[PDB]
Structure 1
Amino acid sequence: DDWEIPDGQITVGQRIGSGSFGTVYKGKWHGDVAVKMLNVTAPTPQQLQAFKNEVGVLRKTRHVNILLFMGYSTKPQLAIVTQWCEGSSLYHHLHIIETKFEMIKLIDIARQTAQGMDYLHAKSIIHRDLKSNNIFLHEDLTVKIGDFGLATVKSRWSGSHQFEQLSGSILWMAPEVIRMQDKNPYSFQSDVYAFGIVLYELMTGQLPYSNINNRDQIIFMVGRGYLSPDLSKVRSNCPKAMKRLMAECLKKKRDERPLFPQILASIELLARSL
């Protein structure tokens, strides 16, 4: 119950890219891992102990559809060490490589994703940052959900106050999360909303708000309830029971959205049904 990796253990290699709260390097550590050099460079010792606690809970997470959290380091700089996926992010498949999956396999991707999410909520873990960039397709088949939790390194602390600076990608963000108006905007249904957007990806082959090209325009209108993903764009042959499920996750008021126990259930029903 004190998980830290020392220096000289982690062979930091190629610079892979940067996200909403760190920069990732492919490192080595008893095999390929993923080394994410957090953006909170100088951690306050009140922030530093909250991070330690949260790593404890991410460490005890073990699920087929979850990327293993292997602990962290602090030697050069504060960082994070997780499994290395040889797959490509679902985002890459859908919007860059434009992989041509069958509807049978699309629905399976949705099923395993709700499968993993359901375990996280079962262990009372809010992802906070569920998007198709954080979903890899390991060996081109299994789904693996990374970048979960970690509320304390995505908050930029003052001295002892975690005031969540809205960051992440604005798509996938539930309206109440956009607004940052009521304390704990991140909730199990904020994740369901995110999940619903990822269904939109799967069912349409497009990101939401394709006809809008203004970052701040989307932030304001979605937060105000004026903007909503155009479900018209769902492909011709996507199940009727599927589109309805997507629409329930996208409800503007969080309390109307379903939780994952029910959501996963819904997916398995239309799964065998064809």
Structure 2
Amino acid sequence: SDEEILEKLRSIVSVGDPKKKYTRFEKIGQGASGTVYTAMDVATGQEVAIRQMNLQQQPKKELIINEILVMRENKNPNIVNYLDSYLVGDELWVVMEYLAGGSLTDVVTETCMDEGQIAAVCRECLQALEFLHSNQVIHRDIKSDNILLGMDGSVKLTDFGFCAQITPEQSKRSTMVGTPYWMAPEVVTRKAYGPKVDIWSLGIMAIEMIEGEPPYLNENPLRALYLIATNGTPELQNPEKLSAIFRDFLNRCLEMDVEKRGSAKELLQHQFLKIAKPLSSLTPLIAAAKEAT
């Protein structure tokens, strides 16, 4: 019920108006998702991102309550920090850490990453994933669009609007929530998937970092999902250009057999990650991608 949704949100949020804590509001996006701003925390000077949503036109509000509750209780260095929230009448404000370097998509579409830079990004993402999975949280929409980058080369996962909380009683999910091109084949071929769907998606992201797009991007998402299910592990355009250790890492992320596919904990030990450059090595790519827009 709409009234119970509001009462639940009232309990979660900080009291009063967000304008009593945040100052220099500047709009950076608007849609059906709501309006997104950057702003400054009056007390700390911190630059923040603020999502403003009208609840009278938010169609799946249980998802927002879930998102806030999950983020609040699963803080991690490699996850964009949930900071606070406010509710004014029908208007919900969600205050987040802001990263000014844009998304990994901007980087992969505008620049050419080397293996050391790719390894650094994969490592940071797997750190977030190992934490979430150990906490029985599946992200379920891992893709370059959802990796935000700091000007210092920090790498952080965002958008928990699609995540799942699992239990030993119900350790597998069946809902198709992910973006088609990044979806593991078992999401469509079976009705029981687990945390390793995020590992598959990470593998596809590594393909983005190599080739600039996930496999089948040019195809209708409906066709892509059939292709994923029937082709299985995607083929690289030029696998000879990659190191043997990177090819091995990709093989372990994109294994068809879920049991054989690496977990996040296992993949954190992979020798591909050991060639990682410092995160500072990403800064020129981030600067270049930001300029290119």
TM-score band by shorter chain is 0.7 to 0.9
Q: Is the 8 A contact 1:174 1:193 kept in 2?
A: yes
Tell me the equivalent position of 1:171. 181
Q: TM-score normalized by structure 1? A: 0.75
Over the matched positions of the two proteins, sequence identity in percent amounts to 22
- Greater relative contact order (Cα 8 A, min sep 6): structure 1 or 2? 2
Tell me the equivalent position of 2:288. none
Judging changes above 3 Å, is the alpha-carbon distance between structure 1 residues 255 and 14 closer, same or farther for their aligned structure 2 residues? Answer: same
Tell me the equivalent position of 2:263. 259
Judging changes above 3 Å, is the alpha-carbon distance between structure 1 residues 207 and 239 closer, same or farther for their aligned structure 2 residues? Answer: same
Q: How many residue pairs are counted as aligned between the two chains?
A: 251
Aligned amino acid, residue 193 of structure 1: W
| Equivalent of 1:25 in 33, 36, 58 | 36
| Equivalent of 1:62 in 75, 91, 107 | 75
| Equivalent of 1:122 in 134, 153, 165 | 134
Partner deviation per Cα, 1:173-207 (whole Å, 9 max, x = no partner): 1123245x52x54x211111111111111233332
d(CA) in 1 for partners of 2:149, 2:15: 30
- Pairwise CA distance, 1:52: 4.3
Structure 2 unpaired stretches of 5+: 1-10, 165-172, 278-293
Partner deviation per Cα, 1:204-252 (whole Å, 9 max, x = no partner): 3332125x42222112332xx2134642324644221211221222233
More helix by share: 2
Q: Is the 8 A contact 1:200 1:234 kept in 2?
A: no
The reply to whether residue 231 of structure 1 matches residue 241 of structure 2 is: no
Q: Is the 8 A contact 1:242 1:270 kept in 2?
A: no
Partner deviation per Cα, 1:1-30 (whole Å, 9 max, x = no partner): x54145531566414255xx8345114361
Tell me the equivalent position of 2:98. 84
Tell me the equivalent position of 1:4. 13
Judging changes above 3 Å, is the alpha-carbon distance between structure 1 residues 53 and 147 closer, same or farther for their aligned structure 2 residues? Answer: closer
Aligned amino acid, residue 91 of structure 1: T
d(CA) in 1 for partners of 2:275, 2:18: 45
Judging changes above 3 Å, is the alpha-carbon distance between structure 1 residues 53 and 202 closer, same or farther for their aligned structure 2 residues? Answer: closer
Judging changes above 3 Å, is the alpha-carbon distance between structure 1 residues 17 and 3 closer, same or farther for their aligned structure 2 residues? Answer: same
The reply to whether residue 188 of structure 1 matches residue 195 of structure 2 is: yes
- Pairwise CA distance, 1:259: 0.5
The reply to whether residue 144 of structure 1 matches residue 144 of structure 2 is: no
Q: TM-score normalized by structure 2? A: 0.71
Let me know the Cα RMSD of the aligned residues. 3.5
| Equivalent of 1:214 in 213, 216, 220 | 220
Structure 1 unpaired stretches of 5+: 153-162
Structure (1 or 2) with the larger CA radius of gyration: 2
Tell me the equivalent position of 1:72. 85
- Pairwise CA distance, 1:79: 5.0
- Pairwise CA distance, 1:68: 0.2
Aligned amino acid, residue 14 of structure 1: K
Aligned amino acid, residue 266 of structure 1: H
